[PDB]
Design a protein around this ligand. Structure first.
Ligand SMILES: [Zn+2]
Ligand SMILES: [Zn+2]
Ligand SMILES: [Zn+2]
Length: 178
């Protein structure tokens, strides 16, 4: 197995996947690495199994259909994986914890949002449809763009939203378009 966390790229107290060479900090994996379970398979491996069991699941889908899906176990897992893919980028640090807003010429957002809040909401089964998770994720970046205005720091929101959207299209097999 790897000797660094797949998510944050640091060593430490690492749990190793039994079916692939990846490794994880306990709270870097989503869901948090399970207490017992021998063998243990990571979220990457669990996602690959869903695909392998239903090869047709990779055919193109419309985003509007995907958003309306109820959060049954497979969709829960897909949203956990998509969240984890965002944490895998180091620029997610800016969006992880609760923000505050005190900048001359700007007013904070009406509905603040951050990655650790989405993580808690998934763990608590607070989303009933994919749409609830996707709307909170996109709100993170939209709040950032609106608040930072013409500051070049706005670009961080565009960057991490692009990681989110590429992974969304991949994980939920969104129909490719020009
Ligand atoms: Zn880690
Ligand atoms: Zn694995
Ligand atoms: Zn099938």
């Amino acid at each position: 197995n790897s000797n660094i966390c797949e998510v944050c790229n640091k060593w430490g107290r690492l749990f190793c996947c039994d079916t692939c060479p990846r490794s994880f900090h306990e709270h870097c994996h989503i869901p948090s690495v399970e207490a017992n379970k021998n063998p243990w398979s990571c979220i990457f491996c669990r996602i690959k199994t869903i695909q392998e069991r239903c090869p047709e699941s990779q055919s193109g889908h419309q985003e509007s259909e995907v958003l309306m899906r109820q959060m049954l176990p497979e969709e829960q897992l897909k949203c956990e994986f998509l969240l984890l893919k965002v944490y895998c980028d180091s620029k997610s640090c800016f969006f992880a914890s609760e923000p505050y807003y005190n900048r001359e010429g700007s007013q904070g957002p009406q509905k603040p949002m951050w990655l650790n809040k989405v993580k808690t909401s998934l763990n608590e089964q607070m989303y009933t449809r994919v749409e609830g998770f996707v709307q909170d994720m996109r709100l993170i970046f939209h709040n950032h763009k609106e608040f930072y205005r013409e500051d070049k720091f706005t670009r961080l929101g565009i960057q991490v939203q692009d990681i989110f959207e590429k992974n969304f299209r991949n994980i939920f097999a969104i129909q490719e378009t020009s």
